[PDB]
Write a protein that binds this ligand. Sequence first.
Ligand SMILES: CC(=O)N[C@@H]1[C@@H](O)[C@H](O[C@@H]2OC(C(=O)O)=C[C@H](O)[C@H]2O)[C@@H](CO)O[C@@H]1O
Ligand SMILES: [Zn+2]
Length: 747
Amino acid sequence: QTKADVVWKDVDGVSMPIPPKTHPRLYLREQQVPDLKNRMNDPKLKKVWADMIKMQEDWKPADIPEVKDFRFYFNQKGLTVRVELMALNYLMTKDPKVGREAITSIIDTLETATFKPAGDISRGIGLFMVTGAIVYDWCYDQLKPEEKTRFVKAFVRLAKMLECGYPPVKDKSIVGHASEWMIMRDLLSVGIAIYDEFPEMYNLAAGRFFKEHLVARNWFYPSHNYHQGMSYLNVRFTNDLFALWILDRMGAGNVFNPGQQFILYDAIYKRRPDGQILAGGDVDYSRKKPKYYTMPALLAGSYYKDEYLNYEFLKDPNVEPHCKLFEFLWRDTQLGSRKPDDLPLSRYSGSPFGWMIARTGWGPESVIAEMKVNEYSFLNHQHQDAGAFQIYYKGPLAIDAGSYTGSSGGYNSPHNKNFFKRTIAHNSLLIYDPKETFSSSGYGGSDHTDFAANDGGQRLPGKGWIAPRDLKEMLAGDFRTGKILAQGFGPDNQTPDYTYLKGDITAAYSAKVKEVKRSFLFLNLKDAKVPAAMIVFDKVVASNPDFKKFWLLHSIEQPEIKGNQITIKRTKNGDSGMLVNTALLPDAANSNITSIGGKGKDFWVFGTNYTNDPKPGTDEALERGEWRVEITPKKAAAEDYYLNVIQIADNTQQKLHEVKRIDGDKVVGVQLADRIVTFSKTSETVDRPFGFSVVGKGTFKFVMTDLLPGTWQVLKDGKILYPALSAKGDDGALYFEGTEGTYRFLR
Ligand SMILES: CC(=O)N[C@@H]1[C@@H](O)[C@H](O[C@@H]2OC(C(=O)O)=C[C@H](O)[C@H]2O)[C@@H](CO)O[C@@H]1O
Ligand SMILES: [Zn+2]
């Protein structure tokens, strides 16, 4: 970590650091050179070094693939490993000979290397460049002049092959491949290295980083989450952190908003007791291999001295071979670790996310609930899933359906364009305009289509469903998808009885709607037999009554529908959770409850099924799901309200809680167990007096939402009960306890 000591100057109105005139300055500075001897003698890093020396042997000829993937180069072997270890050895011994061998071992091949086109080859080329930059900066004072010219020219030749182009003016700065290794590690590392001879490279690489990449990352960082889904969180957040470490070790301090520290807590909250991670954005599923965020936990953990993240890394302290050197140089072996068992049970991610993760524990019995507004969309690996909810408990119950890969293909698959990334795949809301079109001409890198299917979902923002170049372009465009209206959890911070969230998601949709709102209320019922519930209350106003509205609930197994009750079970893979939904609004007379699914109908989108069967032996628990429940109004209307109450329990639980709808003037609500929860009848702010009646035994906990913040008064049976309570602005809510009787609220 150290304090910045380089000189800053504005370039085109943007402050940027200037590389110091001194070597070493890549991945470390002179200041930390003498500390390598101890890292060699630190046993936890002994194995790491041992591993790298093993990596020195060449690929045995017959085992070389022939299709030279990025997977082939990231599994680094042979000469390039050797020269890195020579260059390191040169820092440690100062020995002219050791340094000169590194320079001549690498230089010929660096200027000659050829790279056959293959999947994400820029990764290979980029890592080759790193190898070169290490020798160049680490052995700078052993370089002959002719050699520097040779190296500079080799680097430029290699740069011109990178996908972002050289100059690096191509692709995207918030998402996409240019948001990965090519600029934040690879191009940056070389530019730093050759700055004395050819500063243009640094000026371009870091130019774009500070002008674009950084600005866009600092903007969302304060909310401690990431937008690329729970798989690509790995590569993308890793490359942010490479920039972090690189520039700090250059002498530029931490250039990112320090909130970066808390981003990976979101992964921790999503860990299932079966070793898997809660789904989101582009992911696949497995029950064979637990998922880890090894590199992010390492880099962020060690830089910010964070024990919760460090523990995360300690789960599987095995870094990909091309990164073993960065473990060795940057890993904090002194830093401690803690299990997550003592963290608060709910975490909130503010603008531009508006996301709640809610839990009932950290052990085998944990319910895990996710609630999402989405203020903006980042595209790429993010799905158009505004308003979506997800519930796991002893297995996935209320699912985030579909899968990234399968029989359909991968990123470019029909299944991606037409189901996976679309609203229909999610526990959200559909409003079907038969005449809506969805421009997709810019999506993906293969198999381009001008349009994608109509799923009655949210728009495809951007110029044909591509991400914007950067934050400026984003904000000037059409990527806004909603607004957080209210949020909170309490009354205790550690074990909140409820978790609350409300968003206006109207902007996610086309002019087909006038207003779309969703209020989630998750209750931690603090009880083994039935440990959680979630109330969802929606307002949908369409530009045309004849636009069919849908409410969706996805599952793995077939749901049973019995009147106003929906029962979903897990009976496979050792899961045994149960979700039961009580449909309160629309009421039985205006409600159509229908299931769709089974073979041929699992990825169904109005007349067409976007087949995506797993590659044999994968997704063994079928978490890409096979069934969904649709709730539609019988009666065509511009304005409809949905009110659904979910309960979680073991699929062996006979008796659950009875759910009563509460109807007052101005408000609509739900009573179950000892919880009372109310909403504005119109889902707009309540600013006049209102009331309702409670009937039932014992003490109740009340959460009244949609209130005008200020001082409310609470009466019961005509007499003052709480002369003055305060509804605050963030949640617009009252919380209090009370027994049965007839209530009035004054303001
Ligand atoms: C700008 C963004 O929409 N670019 C797309 C790539 O993300 C996508 O590549 C897939 O995703 C990734 C990755 O982002 O790490 C790696 C693999 O190359 C792909 O699985 C490509 C694929 O055609 O399309 C877009 O250019
Ligand atoms: Zn999804």
